[PDB]
């Protein structure tokens, strides 16, 4: 059900790298937006030559801030800033 009601609004990610800090709208949900390193081989078209990993930090209302990479975080709900 957590995905049977998985709404796809596709909102932009506002993330600052240089250690990454992303902002998102007010969700009002205790679930912390999670990051993870995953494979660059899956897709609906998948242009060739996918041989790097991708670190994606995604949550409920704000779309996943993903970036190719060529309790180690923080989630401020009173400011809504993720690090």
């Amino acid at each position: 059900e957590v995905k049977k009601f998985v709404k796809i609004g596709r909102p932009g990610y506002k993330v600052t790298k240089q250690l990454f800090q992303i902002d998102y709208p007010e969700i009002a949900e205790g679930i912390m937006p999670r990051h993870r390193f995953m494979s660059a081989y899956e897709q609906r078209i998948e242009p060739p030559d996918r041989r790097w990993q991708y670190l994606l930090m995604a949550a409920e209302p704000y779309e996943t801030i993903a970036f190719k990479v060529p309790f180690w975080t923080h989630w401020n709900r009173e400011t809504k800033q993720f690090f």
Binding site: K17, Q18, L19, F20, V69, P70, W72
Partner: protein, 79 residues
């Protein structure tokens, strides 16, 4: 967890360069970079072993999304 895994070892990236630029956050005790024996160039992966977990955590946090001679490097936590 006092290890920094430096992904992105550039063309002339040596353990001296890595532990020198990431030495200021804490005493780094060892360094080891996987160098392709058939290529003489590193595999884009190095390991700096400090004694301080605060040092290595601050290093992973401030040295991620890094750059050394025009190369977008990233420091992560070794397992």
């Amino acid at each position: 967890k006092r290890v920094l895994y430096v992904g992105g070892l550039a063309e002339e990236v040596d353990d001296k360069v890595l532990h020198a630029a990431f030495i200021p956050f804490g005493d780094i005790t060892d360094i080891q970079i996987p160098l392709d024996y058939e290529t003489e160039k590193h595999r884009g992966f190095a390991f700096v072993e400090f004694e301080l977990a605060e040092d290595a955590a601050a290093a992973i946090d401030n040295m991620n999304e890094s750059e050394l001679f025009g190369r977008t490097i990233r420091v992560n936590l070794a397992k």
